[PDB]
Amino acid sequence: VTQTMKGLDIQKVAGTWYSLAMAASDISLLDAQSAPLRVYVEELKPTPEGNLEILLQKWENGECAQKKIIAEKTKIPAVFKIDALNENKVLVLDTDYKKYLLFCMENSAEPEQSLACQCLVRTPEVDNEALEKFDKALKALPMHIRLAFNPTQLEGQCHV
């Protein structure tokens, strides 16, 4: 049920990103700042072997904490394997490289109980084109929670 970006060129995604919007299949995955998938991307770091480090922040004990997820390449440039956040896959749905990137995380063993997707932007501003693409990509996905952040939140501590 999940699109992939064909021919993703990972080298072109390196840098800071901001989580502009996120949505999940289960409310509890994103409900409250403590939710397990309430993670805010800070940076994408493609590696020399073509794997991807995903640097995130999350609230922990009243502080914005860092978490690094190692995502390992597969035969499809846009799909990476992980072992974090109870997930086992990262899918890059679409990117223009220069402005936005859409991705989802899930666990193959139960996507309906694990799907979370994000709209990332390079600059901490609302990009309505990117949000339109995100919402279109998600149109037929079974999301039950959706959040979209404003520039103050993007400049805040862990999106507050």
Which residues face 121 on adjacent strands? 18, 100
Q: In the numeric block, which tokens belong to residue 19?
A: 């989580």
Length of the chain: 160
- The whole-angstrom separation of Cα 119 and Cα 121 is 7
Of residues 38 through 97, those in contact with Na ion by CB under 5 A are: 43, 45
Q: In the numeric block, which tokens belong to residue 68?
A: 């690094």
Query: Which of ligand [N+], Cl ion, Na ion, none does residue 152 bind to, with CB < 5 to 8 Å depending on kind?
Result: none
Q: Does 36 participate in binding Cl ion (rule CB under 5 A)?
A: yes
Q: In this chain, which stretch among 8-16, 35-43, 69-77, 107-115 interacts with Cl ion, using CB under 5 A?
A: 35-43
Buried b (16+ CB within 10 A) or exposed e, 49-84: eeebebbbbbbeeeebeeeebebebeeebbbbebeb
Q: How far is the CB of 153 from Na ion (least distance, A)?
A: 22
Query: Which of Cl ion, ligand [N+], Na ion, none does residue 36 bind to, with CB < 5 to 8 Å depending on kind?
Result: Cl ion
Footprint on this chain of ligand [N+] (rule: CB under 6 A): 9, 11-12, 25-26, 32-33, 73-74, 76-77, 79-80, 83, 86-88, 94, 96-98, 126-128, 133, 144
